[PDB]
Amino acid sequence: GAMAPSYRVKRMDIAKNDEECVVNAANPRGLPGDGVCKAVYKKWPESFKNSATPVGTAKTVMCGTYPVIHAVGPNFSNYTESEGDRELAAAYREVAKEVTRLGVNSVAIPLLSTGVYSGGKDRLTQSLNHLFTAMDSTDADVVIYCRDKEWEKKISEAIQMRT
Ligand SMILES: N#C[C@@H]1CCS(=O)(=O)C1
Ligand SMILES: [Cl-]
Ligand SMILES: [Cl-]
Ligand SMILES: [Cl-]
């Protein structure tokens, strides 16, 4: 565990993270994909060996000794709002289990289903709250990665509001 477990946000590529493990915003088939998933494929291609896993689940594969937690958020193009919400919450609960099992003191996490799986909606608050719901009972330092300047401000605001 971290001595004083925290949440932070950074605006940069999660493939350059300074944490003990990474969460991939994976597809269910373990394909290289786009966005975060492709950056993760380029950095930790070895972690894509048998990484395929269903929607709402997380599967960890080592790259050397570095854990890559493949978390499959729903594609809101395919799911109803209600079912997509349920699966997005579930993916994050599975990430919390894996982070706990691995015994890491820090984890780099993107906001699941906020990019090409968002169904063209802004899901910052929805995705972040499900992240908090899952990770609040863990003692790892959580570092959230984003790419948009306005999202960095809103995530930072949401973290500070609860401190
Ligand atoms: N990043 C991202 C989204 C989820 C996996 S993907 O690369 O297929 C699209
Ligand atoms: Cl960067
Ligand atoms: Cl996405
Ligand atoms: Cl972003």
Resolution (A): 1.5
Task: Give the Cβ contact number of residue 4 at 10 Å.
Answer: 7
Read off φ and ψ for residue 52, nearest 5 degrees.
-55, 135
CA 82 to chain centre: 20
Torsion angle of the four alpha carbons 102, 136, 143, 77, in this order, in degrees rounded to the nearest 10? 90
Tokens representing residue 105 in the block: 């003191």
Taking 3-state DSSP, the helix, strand and coil percentages for the chain, each rounded to the nearest 5, stand at 40, 20, 40
Domain boundaries, the chain: 1-163
Torsion angle of the four alpha carbons 9, 14, 20, 25, in this order, in degrees rounded to the nearest 10? 100
Q: What is the DSSP string of 38-91?
A: HHHHHH-GGGGTT----TT-EEEEEETTEEEEEE----TTTS-HHHHHHHHHHH
Q: How far is 34 from 16, CA to CA, in rounded Å?
A: 17
Q: How far is 73 from 55, CA to CA, in rounded Å?
A: 6
Distance 82 CA to ligand 2 centre (A): 34
Q: Ligand 1: does its nearest atom lie under 6 Å from the Cβ of 95?
A: no
Handedness of CA 61, 120, 133, 108 (dihedral sign): positive
Distance 119 CA to ligand 2 centre (A): 25
With CA atoms as reference, report the closest residue to 43 among 65, 15, 13: 15
Structural element, H or E, at residue 100: helix 81-102
CA 8 to chain centre: 13
Q: Ligand 1: does its nearest atom lie under 6 Å from the Cβ of 36?
A: yes
Q: Which amino acid is at 45?
A: P
- The C-alpha R_g of the chain, in whole angstroms, comes to 14
- Determination technique for this PDB entry? X-ray
